[PDB]
Every structure is written in structure tokens, then in C-alpha cells.
Amino acid sequence: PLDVALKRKYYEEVRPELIRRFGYQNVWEVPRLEKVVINQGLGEAKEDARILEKAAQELALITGQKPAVTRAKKSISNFKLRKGMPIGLRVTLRRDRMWIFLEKLLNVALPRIRDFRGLNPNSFDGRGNYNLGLREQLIFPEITYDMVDALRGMDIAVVTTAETDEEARALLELLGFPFRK
């Protein structure tokens, strides 16, 4: 495992504040990050084209990971979509690639967001997990306006071993998650 700026910050500064603020007796009771799972629910390339191959190309430039295709569980007429069409891209980030992703997410990407008023403090799982969406891909550093060709955002899932929202609210904010209210 390599030195990751946010990884250090978790261990040196976030760990003891949580123990302090919550009082766990066991070094494993203190909440952690489990994984970050990114999902572009593209669904436009249902039949229109093979535009996914470019989005998996960019999602790999952002996370360092080639994502996997998601396909339609059933068939939907109104969505103009049959069962089994490639309709999205999921990538699962763990360990360092998870850290390295959020480090850039919080430091440069969430700032470079247009008209940013902070993350919604109400998007917590109800069981200690958090989810936020996005509208673009140039928000992330590695995506230039030259290479862009379509405006595709994503959903972001951050999973924590915290049992409650309040334990997870503290864990994320102590890492650098700008919460609106």
C-alpha cells in the first residue's frame, strides 16, 4: 500500500477524533470506508450506439479501473429497451484506488463543480452509507473539454462499516466532505 494523502488523514486525524467523539472500546468498532462504487446509468446507448466504450474509457481515466457493463434485468417498452441491453457502467473501488479517487474527488472535483453549495446532508443510507450524484465528467481532473463528446454524469456510493448515520456523518465530514446544511 502506498502513501495516499487522504489515507494518511484518515488514520492520523480521523481515527482518534471518532474514538474521542464516540468512545468505541474496540479498534474495529471505529467506522471505516468499505468501498466506493461508481455507476453511470447511461441507458442512452441502449440501442442508439456503442457510446459506452468511450464512457468506460473516461471512467477508467478517472478511477484507474476499467468498469463493467450493466444490463437490463427485464424488458421495458417505454424505455425503448429490451431485456439484456448494455445500459450502464459500474466500477467498484476498494483500498488505495478508493482513497486516490476520493482524494481527487474532494480536493479538485467537488470544487470544480459548477455552482457548488455542498453535499446534501440528507443523502445518508439511513444505515451509515452515503450516495451522491453528478451531472458531468469534466468535473473530475483527468477529463478535458477536448476529449469530451457527451455530457454524462454518474451516481456515487460510499459504503462504511459504521452502523448509524451519525457515525458515518462524522466519518465523512472528518475526511473533507463539504456538507451544505
Partner: protein, 118 residues
Amino acid sequence: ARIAGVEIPRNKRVDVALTYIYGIGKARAKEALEKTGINPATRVKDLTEAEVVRLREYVENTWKLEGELRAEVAANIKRLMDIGCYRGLRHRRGLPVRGQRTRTNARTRKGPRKTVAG
């Protein structure tokens, strides 16, 4: 997002390019270039990022732009909406605000014509 959260057209003049951003008219187009020591009549395809960030820092600090402009005006009309002032009514129903006639035109304010039978 070159400046103010918007990429600005290349192969164009830097005063014209700044107009290609929400909140920068021709009067503000020149204001920076003189007050930033920046040659107005040259491409964006030949600019150092010293001038660029000098230009970017100038316009994003001095001037309410892109998002903040849009939201602020968006809030101002809303106050007239809330209180029940005449301009607030005429902002709801899509009628004019500045006292124009309505018997005929206003089509910009009222979209394409809703032709009627009878």
C-alpha cells in the same frame, strides 16, 4: 471551463471571447484587458496562462458571473412573485413586465401562437 466555469472560444479576440461568458458584456469585455495589461486584439490560441489566470482571477472575483448571476436574478423575480407585486404576477403568468401592449405582440414573452377556433 477555461474561465468563470466556461471554456472560451479559441481563434477569437480576447474581448469577444469574454462576452462568451454569462455576465460579461462588451463594456466588461474591455475593462479587464486594459486593467490586466492584456492585449485585447489577439487570439486565445496565443495566450500565456499567466495572463489567463490573471484574467480568470480578475473576472471571477470582481464580477458576479455564470452561476451566481443566474441565481441572483432568479431570486429577485421570485421576491416579486412572493410579495404579490405587479411584476411578480406578470412573471408567473408569462405576460410582459415593462408595460408593453398585449393585444397583439409579446410573442417573445408568450412563445409561439396558440391559434384559436372561432
